[PDB]
Amino acid sequence: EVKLVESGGGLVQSGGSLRLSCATSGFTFTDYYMSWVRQPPGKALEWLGFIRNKANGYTTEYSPSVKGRFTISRDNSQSILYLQMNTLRAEDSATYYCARDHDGYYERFSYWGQGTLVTVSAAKTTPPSVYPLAPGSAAQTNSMVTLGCLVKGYFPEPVTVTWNSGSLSSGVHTFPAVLQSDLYTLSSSVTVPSSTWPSETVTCNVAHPASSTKVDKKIVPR
Amino acid sequence: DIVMSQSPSSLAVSAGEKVTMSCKSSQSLLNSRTRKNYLAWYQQKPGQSPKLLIYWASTRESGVPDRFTGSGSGTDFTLTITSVQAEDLAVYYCKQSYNLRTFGGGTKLEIKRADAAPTVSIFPPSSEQLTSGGASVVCFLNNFYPKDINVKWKIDGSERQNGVLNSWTDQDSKDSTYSMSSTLTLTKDEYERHNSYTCEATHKTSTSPIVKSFNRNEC
Ligand SMILES: [Mg+2]
Ligand SMILES: [Mg+2]
Ligand SMILES: [Zn+2]
Secondary structure, three states, X not given: OOEEEEEOXXXXXXOOOEEEEEEEEOOOHXXXXXXXXXXXXXOOOEXXXXXXXXXXXXXXXXXXXXXXXXXXXXEOOOOEEEEEEOOOOHHHOEEEEEEEEOOOOOOOOOOEXXXXXEEEOOOOOEOOEEEEXXXXXXXXXXXXXXXXXXXXXXXXXXXXXXXXXXXXXXXXXXXXXXXXXXXXXXXXXXXXXXXXXXXXXOEEEEEEHHHOEEEEEEOOOO | OOOXXXXXXXXXXXXXXXXXXXXXXXXXXXXXXXXXXXXXXXXXXXXXXXXXXXXXXXXXXXXXXXXXXXXXXXXXXXXXXXXXOHHHOEEEEEEEOOOOXXXXXXXXXXXEOOOEOOEEEEEOOOHHHHHOOEEEEEEEEEEEEOOOOEEEEEEOOEEEOOOEEEEEOOOOOOOOOEEEEEEEEEEHHHHHHOOEEEEEEEOOOOOOOEEEEEEOOOO
Protein backbone atom coordinates (compact mmCIF):
# COMPACT_ATOMS: atom_id res chain seq x y z
CA GLU A 1 0.00 0.00 0.00
CA VAL A 2 2.81 2.30 1.05
CA LYS A 3 5.03 1.97 -2.00
CA LEU A 4 8.54 3.25 -2.62
CA VAL A 5 9.86 2.61 -6.13
CA GLU A 6 13.36 3.51 -7.27
CA SER A 7 14.33 3.98 -10.91
CA GLY A 8 17.04 5.63 -12.99
CA GLY A 9 19.70 3.07 -12.16
CA GLY A 10 21.80 1.42 -14.81
CA LEU A 11 25.07 2.02 -16.58
CA VAL A 12 27.29 5.12 -16.48
CA GLN A 13 30.95 5.97 -17.17
CA SER A 14 33.46 7.36 -14.65
CA GLY A 15 33.07 11.08 -14.05
CA GLY A 16 29.54 10.84 -15.39
CA SER A 17 26.29 12.04 -13.83
CA LEU A 18 23.17 10.07 -12.90
CA ARG A 19 19.89 11.02 -11.27
CA LEU A 20 17.80 8.43 -9.36
CA SER A 21 14.12 8.74 -8.46
CA CYS A 22 11.88 7.23 -5.79
CA ALA A 23 8.16 7.55 -6.47
CA THR A 24 5.83 7.14 -3.51
CA SER A 25 2.19 6.85 -2.38
CA GLY A 26 0.16 5.36 0.47
CA PHE A 27 1.13 8.06 2.98
CA THR A 28 1.34 11.87 3.18
CA PHE A 29 4.79 12.47 1.69
CA THR A 30 5.23 15.97 3.04
CA ASP A 31 5.17 14.72 6.67
CA TYR A 32 8.26 12.47 6.44
CA TYR A 33 12.04 12.67 6.23
CA MET A 34 13.35 10.57 3.32
CA SER A 35 16.67 8.70 3.29
CA TRP A 36 18.95 7.27 0.64
CA VAL A 37 21.01 4.18 1.47
CA ARG A 38 23.32 2.18 -0.75
CA GLN A 39 24.99 -1.19 -0.82
CA PRO A 40 27.88 -2.40 -3.02
CA PRO A 41 27.47 -6.05 -4.13
CA GLY A 42 28.14 -8.31 -1.12
CA LYS A 43 28.98 -5.39 1.17
CA ALA A 44 27.38 -3.46 4.06
CA LEU A 45 24.53 -0.96 3.98
CA GLU A 46 25.68 2.67 3.84
CA TRP A 47 23.64 5.75 4.69
CA LEU A 48 24.14 8.59 2.19
CA GLY A 49 21.97 11.36 3.56
CA PHE A 50 18.40 12.50 4.09
CA ILE A 51 15.94 15.26 3.32
CA ARG A 52 13.74 16.52 6.14
CA ASN A 53 9.95 16.96 6.21
CA LYS A 54 7.96 20.17 5.74
CA ALA A 55 7.81 20.98 9.45
CA ASN A 56 11.59 20.97 9.34
CA GLY A 57 12.09 22.96 6.16
CA TYR A 58 13.00 20.15 3.78
CA THR A 59 16.64 20.70 4.74
CA THR A 60 19.38 18.14 4.10
CA GLU A 61 22.26 16.23 5.66
CA TYR A 62 24.74 13.89 3.94
CA SER A 63 27.49 11.49 4.94
CA PRO A 64 31.17 12.42 4.32
CA SER A 65 31.73 9.91 1.52
CA VAL A 66 29.19 11.83 -0.59
CA LYS A 67 29.84 15.36 0.68
CA GLY A 68 29.49 17.97 -2.06
CA ARG A 69 29.21 15.18 -4.62
CA PHE A 70 25.64 13.98 -4.12
CA THR A 71 22.47 16.06 -3.85
CA ILE A 72 19.06 15.18 -2.43
CA SER A 73 15.87 16.96 -3.47
CA ARG A 74 12.15 16.26 -3.39
CA ASP A 75 9.17 17.07 -5.57
CA ASN A 76 6.42 17.69 -3.04
CA SER A 77 3.63 17.80 -5.61
CA GLN A 78 4.68 14.61 -7.44
CA SER A 79 5.67 12.83 -4.18
CA ILE A 80 8.94 11.79 -5.79
CA LEU A 81 12.39 11.69 -4.15
CA TYR A 82 15.62 12.22 -6.05
CA LEU A 83 19.34 11.66 -5.63
CA GLN A 84 21.68 13.56 -7.93
CA MET A 85 25.00 11.80 -8.29
CA ASN A 86 27.90 13.65 -9.90
CA THR A 87 31.52 12.81 -10.76
CA LEU A 88 30.87 9.08 -10.30
CA ARG A 89 33.44 6.43 -9.48
CA ALA A 90 33.76 2.61 -9.37
CA GLU A 91 33.11 2.42 -5.62
CA ASP A 92 29.76 4.09 -6.29
CA SER A 93 28.56 0.92 -8.09
CA ALA A 94 25.88 -0.34 -5.77
CA THR A 95 22.21 -0.86 -5.18
CA TYR A 96 20.50 2.36 -4.07
CA TYR A 97 17.55 2.29 -1.71
CA CYS A 98 15.21 5.05 -0.63
CA ALA A 99 13.50 4.75 2.69
CA ARG A 100 10.90 6.61 4.62
CA ASP A 101 12.57 8.07 7.73
CA HIS A 102 11.64 10.39 10.64
CA ASP A 103 12.41 12.11 13.96
CA GLY A 104 12.12 8.70 15.59
CA TYR A 105 9.69 10.56 17.84
CA TYR A 106 6.45 9.34 16.23
CA GLU A 107 5.32 5.71 16.57
CA ARG A 108 5.96 4.66 12.95
CA PHE A 109 6.50 1.73 10.60
CA SER A 110 9.47 1.51 8.20
CA TYR A 111 9.37 1.04 4.41
CA TRP A 112 12.12 0.60 1.81
CA GLY A 113 11.98 0.31 -1.96
CA GLN A 114 13.43 -2.71 -3.75
CA GLY A 115 16.35 -0.52 -4.78
CA THR A 116 17.87 0.34 -8.15
CA LEU A 117 21.28 -0.86 -9.26
CA VAL A 118 23.94 1.55 -10.50
CA THR A 119 26.93 0.12 -12.32
CA VAL A 120 29.93 2.32 -13.10
CA SER A 121 32.19 1.27 -15.96
CA ALA A 122 32.87 1.99 -19.61
CA ALA A 123 31.56 -1.32 -20.85
CA LYS A 124 28.66 -1.24 -23.28
CA THR A 125 25.03 -2.11 -22.61
CA THR A 126 24.25 -5.54 -24.13
CA PRO A 127 20.88 -7.35 -24.22
CA PRO A 128 20.91 -11.03 -23.21
CA SER A 129 20.30 -14.02 -25.45
CA VAL A 130 17.80 -16.26 -23.58
CA TYR A 131 18.03 -20.01 -24.26
CA PRO A 132 15.66 -22.79 -23.10
CA LEU A 133 17.11 -25.77 -21.30
CA ALA A 134 15.10 -28.91 -21.98
CA PRO A 135 16.12 -32.43 -20.96
CA GLY A 136 18.24 -34.48 -23.32
CA SER A 137 16.44 -36.88 -25.68
CA ALA A 138 17.62 -39.42 -23.10
CA ALA A 139 15.41 -41.04 -20.46
CA GLN A 140 13.88 -39.28 -17.46
CA THR A 141 14.39 -39.84 -13.72
CA ASN A 142 11.30 -39.87 -11.44
CA SER A 143 7.92 -38.11 -11.57
CA MET A 144 9.52 -34.64 -11.44
CA VAL A 145 11.39 -32.77 -14.15
CA THR A 146 13.95 -29.98 -14.10
CA LEU A 147 13.81 -27.38 -16.87
CA GLY A 148 15.96 -24.26 -17.19
CA CYS A 149 16.96 -21.00 -18.84
CA LEU A 150 20.43 -19.80 -19.77
CA VAL A 151 20.45 -15.96 -19.77
CA LYS A 152 23.66 -15.32 -21.63
CA GLY A 153 25.92 -12.42 -22.54
CA TYR A 154 24.39 -9.25 -21.10
CA PHE A 155 25.62 -6.01 -19.49
CA PRO A 156 25.20 -4.62 -17.03
CA GLU A 157 23.33 -6.27 -14.18
CA PRO A 158 20.61 -6.80 -13.32
CA VAL A 159 18.33 -9.16 -15.13
CA THR A 160 15.12 -10.41 -13.53
CA VAL A 161 13.86 -13.93 -14.03
CA THR A 162 10.36 -15.28 -13.39
CA TRP A 163 8.55 -18.43 -14.58
CA ASN A 164 5.06 -18.16 -16.08
CA SER A 165 4.97 -14.53 -14.94
CA GLY A 166 5.74 -15.46 -11.35
CA SER A 167 2.97 -18.09 -10.94
CA LEU A 168 5.67 -20.74 -10.78
CA SER A 169 7.85 -19.65 -7.83
CA SER A 170 8.15 -22.62 -5.53
CA GLY A 171 10.89 -24.86 -6.93
CA VAL A 172 12.76 -22.13 -8.79
CA HIS A 173 16.53 -21.58 -8.36
CA THR A 174 18.04 -18.50 -10.08
CA PHE A 175 21.84 -18.50 -9.99
CA PRO A 176 23.92 -15.29 -9.55
CA ALA A 177 25.41 -13.84 -12.71
CA VAL A 178 29.06 -14.61 -13.45
CA LEU A 179 31.25 -11.99 -15.09
CA GLN A 180 33.34 -13.16 -18.05
CA SER A 181 35.08 -10.20 -19.74
CA ASP A 182 32.44 -7.50 -20.22
CA LEU A 183 29.52 -9.93 -20.16
CA TYR A 184 27.30 -11.63 -17.60
CA THR A 185 25.83 -15.10 -17.86
CA LEU A 186 23.31 -16.65 -15.43
CA SER A 187 20.86 -19.53 -15.34
CA SER A 188 17.69 -20.50 -13.55
CA SER A 189 16.16 -23.86 -12.92
CA VAL A 190 12.62 -24.89 -12.17
CA THR A 191 11.47 -28.35 -11.15
CA VAL A 192 7.89 -29.31 -11.81
CA PRO A 193 5.73 -32.45 -11.90
CA SER A 194 5.97 -34.59 -15.05
CA SER A 195 2.18 -34.33 -15.10
CA THR A 196 2.68 -30.62 -15.56
CA TRP A 197 5.31 -30.49 -18.33
CA PRO A 198 5.04 -30.69 -21.32
CA SER A 199 1.32 -31.14 -20.55
CA GLU A 200 1.12 -27.43 -19.79
CA THR A 201 3.02 -24.27 -20.78
CA VAL A 202 6.22 -23.46 -18.90
CA THR A 203 7.86 -20.17 -19.85
CA CYS A 204 10.77 -18.24 -18.40
CA ASN A 205 10.39 -14.44 -18.55
CA VAL A 206 13.66 -12.49 -18.53
CA ALA A 207 13.88 -8.69 -18.25
CA HIS A 208 16.91 -6.46 -18.86
CA PRO A 209 16.19 -2.90 -17.62
CA ALA A 210 19.44 -1.48 -18.92
CA SER A 211 18.49 -2.44 -22.46
CA SER A 212 14.75 -2.05 -21.92
CA THR A 213 14.43 -5.68 -23.12
CA LYS A 214 12.04 -8.48 -22.17
CA VAL A 215 12.24 -12.02 -23.55
CA ASP A 216 9.71 -14.77 -22.98
CA LYS A 217 11.01 -18.18 -23.82
CA LYS A 218 8.84 -21.29 -23.92
CA ILE A 219 10.53 -24.56 -22.98
CA VAL A 220 9.38 -27.21 -25.41
CA PRO A 221 10.78 -30.78 -25.49
CA ARG A 222 13.50 -31.50 -28.01
CA ASP B 1 30.60 10.77 13.47
CA ILE B 2 29.23 7.73 15.23
CA VAL B 3 30.85 4.44 14.33
CA MET B 4 28.89 1.22 14.77
CA SER B 5 30.79 -2.04 15.32
CA GLN B 6 29.09 -5.43 15.01
CA SER B 7 30.31 -8.84 16.25
CA PRO B 8 30.84 -11.48 15.23
CA SER B 9 31.11 -11.25 11.41
CA SER B 10 29.01 -14.41 11.10
CA LEU B 11 27.05 -16.93 13.14
CA ALA B 12 25.92 -20.46 12.44
CA VAL B 13 23.45 -22.71 14.26
CA SER B 14 21.01 -25.51 13.68
CA ALA B 15 17.32 -24.71 13.55
CA GLY B 16 15.98 -24.31 17.08
CA GLU B 17 19.16 -23.11 18.79
CA LYS B 18 19.67 -19.60 20.15
CA VAL B 19 22.03 -16.87 18.94
CA THR B 20 23.02 -13.36 20.06
CA MET B 21 25.08 -10.78 18.20
CA SER B 22 26.78 -7.57 19.36
CA CYS B 23 26.60 -3.94 18.25
CA LYS B 24 28.59 -1.12 19.82
CA SER B 25 28.62 2.62 19.10
CA SER B 26 31.49 5.05 19.49
CA GLN B 27 29.14 7.11 21.64
CA SER B 28 26.03 6.84 23.75
CA LEU B 29 22.79 6.62 21.85
CA LEU B 30 20.75 7.32 25.00
CA ASN B 31 18.76 10.57 24.72
CA SER B 32 18.62 12.13 28.19
CA ARG B 33 15.24 13.69 27.44
CA THR B 34 13.24 10.92 25.77
CA ARG B 35 14.89 8.16 27.82
CA LYS B 36 15.14 6.18 24.58
CA ASN B 37 18.16 4.59 22.92
CA TYR B 38 18.13 5.35 19.20
CA LEU B 39 19.35 1.97 18.12
CA ALA B 40 17.60 -0.21 15.56
CA TRP B 41 18.15 -3.70 14.21
CA TYR B 42 17.50 -4.80 10.62
CA GLN B 43 17.24 -8.13 8.84
CA GLN B 44 18.21 -8.60 5.24
CA LYS B 45 17.33 -11.89 3.67
CA PRO B 46 19.16 -12.59 0.38
CA GLY B 47 17.83 -10.74 -2.67
CA GLN B 48 15.72 -8.68 -0.33
CA SER B 49 15.58 -5.16 1.03
CA PRO B 50 16.44 -4.53 4.66
CA LYS B 51 13.54 -4.95 7.07
CA LEU B 52 13.16 -3.15 10.39
CA LEU B 53 12.77 -5.67 13.20
CA ILE B 54 13.38 -3.54 16.28
CA TYR B 55 13.73 0.15 17.23
CA TRP B 56 14.54 2.09 20.43
CA ALA B 57 16.73 -0.94 21.14
CA SER B 58 13.89 -2.93 22.76
CA THR B 59 10.74 -2.36 20.80
CA ARG B 60 9.67 -4.92 18.24
CA GLU B 61 7.85 -3.52 15.21
CA SER B 62 4.35 -4.94 14.93
CA GLY B 63 4.41 -8.23 13.04
CA VAL B 64 7.85 -9.28 14.26
CA PRO B 65 8.08 -12.66 16.07
CA ASP B 66 8.61 -12.64 19.86
CA ARG B 67 11.72 -14.73 19.18
CA PHE B 68 13.48 -11.50 18.21
CA THR B 69 14.43 -9.45 21.24
CA GLY B 70 16.83 -6.53 21.56
CA SER B 71 18.65 -5.32 24.67
CA GLY B 72 21.35 -2.91 25.80
CA SER B 73 21.55 0.75 26.66
CA GLY B 74 24.13 3.47 26.22
CA THR B 75 26.83 2.04 23.96
CA ASP B 76 26.51 -1.76 24.09
CA PHE B 77 23.55 -3.44 22.37
CA THR B 78 22.51 -7.05 21.67
CA LEU B 79 20.14 -8.81 19.28
CA THR B 80 18.90 -12.19 20.46
CA ILE B 81 17.02 -14.75 18.43
CA THR B 82 15.47 -17.25 20.90
CA SER B 83 14.81 -20.16 18.54
CA VAL B 84 16.39 -19.66 15.14
CA GLN B 85 14.10 -20.74 12.32
CA ALA B 86 15.34 -21.70 8.86
CA GLU B 87 13.78 -18.60 7.33
CA ASP B 88 16.06 -16.47 9.55
CA LEU B 89 19.02 -16.91 7.24
CA ALA B 90 20.10 -13.29 6.77
CA VAL B 91 22.54 -10.49 7.47
CA TYR B 92 21.48 -8.39 10.47
CA TYR B 93 22.44 -4.74 10.70
CA CYS B 94 22.23 -2.32 13.57
CA LYS B 95 21.77 1.38 12.91
CA GLN B 96 22.03 4.34 15.26
CA SER B 97 19.59 7.24 14.91
CA TYR B 98 21.01 9.48 17.64
CA ASN B 99 22.94 11.82 15.37
CA LEU B 100 22.17 11.48 11.70
CA ARG B 101 22.43 7.80 10.78
CA THR B 102 24.98 5.06 10.49
CA PHE B 103 25.02 1.31 9.93
CA GLY B 104 27.24 -1.35 11.40
CA GLY B 105 29.09 -3.77 9.16
CA GLY B 106 26.50 -6.43 9.77
CA THR B 107 26.41 -9.98 11.16
CA LYS B 108 25.62 -12.85 8.75
CA LEU B 109 23.58 -15.74 10.17
CA GLU B 110 24.00 -19.15 8.50
CA ILE B 111 21.95 -22.28 9.27
CA LYS B 112 23.59 -25.66 10.04
CA ARG B 113 21.68 -28.79 8.89
CA ALA B 114 22.04 -32.49 8.11
CA ASP B 115 23.97 -33.57 5.03
CA ALA B 116 22.15 -33.69 1.68
CA ALA B 117 23.27 -35.09 -1.68
CA PRO B 118 22.84 -32.93 -4.77
CA THR B 119 20.19 -33.72 -7.33
CA VAL B 120 22.04 -33.42 -10.62
CA SER B 121 20.70 -32.75 -14.14
CA ILE B 122 22.51 -31.98 -17.36
CA PHE B 123 21.19 -30.05 -20.36
CA PRO B 124 22.55 -30.13 -23.91
CA PRO B 125 22.99 -26.85 -25.84
CA SER B 126 19.67 -25.56 -27.16
CA SER B 127 19.12 -25.65 -30.95
CA GLU B 128 18.72 -21.88 -30.79
CA GLN B 129 22.10 -21.21 -29.21
CA LEU B 130 23.81 -23.41 -31.81
CA THR B 131 22.64 -21.26 -34.71
CA SER B 132 24.48 -18.36 -33.04
CA GLY B 133 27.70 -20.35 -33.35
CA GLY B 134 27.99 -21.10 -29.64
CA ALA B 135 27.29 -24.15 -27.48
CA SER B 136 26.72 -24.18 -23.73
CA VAL B 137 26.27 -27.41 -21.83
CA VAL B 138 24.62 -26.67 -18.47
CA CYS B 139 24.65 -28.69 -15.26
CA PHE B 140 22.50 -27.88 -12.21
CA LEU B 141 23.46 -29.19 -8.73
CA ASN B 142 20.43 -28.60 -6.55
CA ASN B 143 19.76 -28.78 -2.84
CA PHE B 144 22.94 -30.11 -1.30
CA TYR B 145 24.71 -29.49 2.00
CA PRO B 146 27.32 -28.44 3.00
CA LYS B 147 28.25 -25.86 0.40
CA ASP B 148 31.55 -27.58 -0.41
CA ILE B 149 31.34 -29.43 -3.72
CA ASN B 150 33.47 -30.05 -6.80
CA VAL B 151 32.37 -30.26 -10.41
CA LYS B 152 34.38 -31.89 -13.16
CA TRP B 153 33.39 -31.78 -16.80
CA LYS B 154 34.44 -34.48 -19.20
CA ILE B 155 34.11 -34.53 -22.99
CA ASP B 156 34.54 -37.98 -24.57
CA GLY B 157 35.99 -39.33 -21.34
CA SER B 158 38.67 -36.67 -21.01
CA GLU B 159 38.53 -33.97 -18.33
CA ARG B 160 38.06 -30.31 -19.27
CA GLN B 161 38.57 -26.85 -17.75
CA ASN B 162 38.36 -24.03 -20.27
CA GLY B 163 35.14 -22.06 -20.42
CA VAL B 164 33.61 -23.27 -17.18
CA LEU B 165 31.53 -20.83 -15.17
CA ASN B 166 30.35 -21.80 -11.73
CA SER B 167 27.78 -20.12 -9.55
CA TRP B 168 26.56 -20.96 -6.06
CA THR B 169 23.22 -19.78 -4.68
CA ASP B 170 22.74 -18.27 -1.23
CA GLN B 171 21.51 -20.77 1.35
CA ASP B 172 17.89 -21.79 0.70
CA SER B 173 15.44 -20.13 3.11
CA LYS B 174 13.12 -23.16 3.17
CA ASP B 175 15.49 -26.09 3.58
CA SER B 176 18.88 -24.53 4.30
CA THR B 177 20.59 -26.26 1.39
CA TYR B 178 22.79 -24.85 -1.34
CA SER B 179 22.50 -25.15 -5.13
CA MET B 180 25.11 -24.62 -7.80
CA SER B 181 25.23 -24.06 -11.53
CA SER B 182 28.04 -25.07 -13.86
CA THR B 183 28.28 -24.06 -17.53
CA LEU B 184 30.66 -25.53 -20.07
CA THR B 185 30.88 -23.24 -23.10
CA LEU B 186 32.23 -24.25 -26.48
CA THR B 187 31.86 -23.12 -30.08
CA LYS B 188 29.40 -24.95 -32.33
CA ASP B 189 32.18 -26.79 -34.17
CA GLU B 190 33.89 -28.17 -31.06
CA TYR B 191 30.68 -29.35 -29.50
CA GLU B 192 29.95 -31.19 -32.75
CA ARG B 193 33.44 -32.74 -33.07
CA HIS B 194 32.90 -34.66 -29.79
CA ASN B 195 30.15 -37.07 -28.71
CA SER B 196 30.04 -37.76 -24.95
CA TYR B 197 29.36 -35.03 -22.38
CA THR B 198 29.62 -35.51 -18.66
CA CYS B 199 29.07 -33.51 -15.50
CA GLU B 200 30.59 -35.03 -12.34
CA ALA B 201 29.81 -33.84 -8.83
CA THR B 202 31.87 -34.81 -5.82
CA HIS B 203 30.30 -34.17 -2.43
CA LYS B 204 31.06 -35.23 1.17
CA THR B 205 27.88 -37.31 0.94
CA SER B 206 29.68 -39.98 -1.11
CA THR B 207 33.12 -41.02 -2.29
CA SER B 208 31.54 -42.02 -5.61
CA PRO B 209 30.81 -38.95 -7.83
CA ILE B 210 27.20 -38.28 -8.75
CA VAL B 211 27.51 -38.68 -12.55
CA LYS B 212 25.24 -37.15 -15.22
CA SER B 213 25.79 -37.25 -18.95
CA PHE B 214 24.50 -37.56 -22.50
CA ASN B 215 25.49 -38.55 -26.00
CA ARG B 216 25.03 -36.00 -28.81
CA ASN B 217 23.32 -38.72 -30.87
CA GLU B 218 21.08 -40.30 -28.19
CA CYS B 219 17.47 -41.23 -28.98
MG1 LIG C 1 26.46 4.06 7.34
MG1 LIG D 1 14.78 -23.95 -2.78
ZN1 LIG E 1 37.95 -30.82 -29.53
